[PDB]
């Protein structure tokens, strides 16, 4: 029987492709095929993925196009990947990470051809920079769940994924389908380019800010600092005077002179120190 230790290893390219398809087709439950290989009985690499046409309305899965799938597979084999289809992925823009009736039917269709086929659900809307909402699934058998069986084998203690969400539990988790743990492959080579993202050229590194604009910015910021200094004097005065509401209900809806003054000093000091250092380094290097 299947084990409660199966792990779907989604590659960086696969994850990026699912997220791009997600925040390209919204709210349509856009869909694609996950290409990889069942290396063993407990692991499923998903090396790549590729989208499907998404013809017309796509609020529901669209009965994977066999001709498009075949031509994708043949050309990928021609230009690289000789890998079979290990599953299908689709998007749930803000719903969560559950499966609908159509999703369950499509995953039955996938299992019929390959018993190990996985169903990945991404949530491009709920994903944030550092945690991508995504979940792998396979369906529980009505036959076994009526004939008193757990359709997962608990050899390991790897069934602590996230205390599955109430959304999934009410949408049919642990009854008609189960969640498969997901990990990722780190190569330290793609990560170099992902780090090269946000990188600035040495032009920007050494450029000096327009001096007139810098002076105007300093003048303005010091003006707001002056006003916030007046307000800070006012606030510190009537702060110890009374603290029944000072704890939480004396700053809501009203400006905080101390906080804004801290922000202004931080920003202006950063700007001035950076520009001074840039000017000095420039005066020497470009001599």
């Amino acid at each position: 029987a299947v084990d409660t230790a199966e792990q779907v290893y989604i590659s960086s390219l696969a994850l990026l492709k699912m997220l791009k398809h997600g925040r390209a087709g919204v709210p349509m439950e856009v869909m694609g095929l996950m290409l990889g290989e069942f290396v063993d009985d407990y692991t499923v690499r998903v090396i790549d993925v590729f989208a499907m046409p998404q013809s017309g309305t796509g609020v529901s899965v669209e009965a994977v196009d066999p001709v498009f799938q075949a031509k994708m597979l043949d050309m990928l084999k021609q230009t690289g990947r000789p890998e079979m289809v290990v599953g299908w992925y689709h998007s749930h823009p803000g719903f969560g990470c559950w499966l609908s009736g159509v999703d369950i039917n499509t995953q039955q269709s996938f299992e019929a051809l390959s018993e190990r086929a996985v169903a990945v659900v991404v949530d491009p809307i709920q994903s944030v920079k550092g945690k991508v909402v995504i979940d792998a699934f396979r369906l529980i058998n009505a036959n076994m769940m009526v004939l008193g069986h757990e359709p997962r084998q608990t050899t390991s203690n790897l069934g602590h994924l996230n205390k599955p969400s109430i959304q999934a539990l009410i949408h049919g988790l642990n009854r008609h389908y189960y969640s498969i743990t997901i990990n990722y492959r780190k190569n330290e080579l793609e990560q170099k380019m992902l780090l090269n993202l946000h990188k600035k050229s040495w032009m920007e590194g050494l450029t000096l800010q327009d001096y007139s604009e810098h002076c105007k910015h300093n003048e303005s910021v010091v003006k707001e600092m002056l006003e916030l200094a007046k307000n800070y004097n006012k606030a510190v005065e009537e702060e110890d005077k009374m603290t029944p509401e000072q704890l939480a209900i004396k700053n809501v809806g009203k400006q905080d002179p101390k906080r804004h003054l801290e922000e202004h000093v931080d920003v202006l000091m950063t700007s001035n120190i950076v520009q001074c250092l840039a000017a000095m380094l420039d005066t020497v290097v470009f001599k």
Binding site: G56, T57, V59, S60
Partner: peptide
Amino acid sequence: ELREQLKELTKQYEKSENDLKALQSVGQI
């Protein structure tokens, strides 16, 4: 007779396929 029979059946096929395509669509607020 099979010509006309299958022609009418194909017309009804097109109608039913259109009906199912419509059935697979939900409204919007």
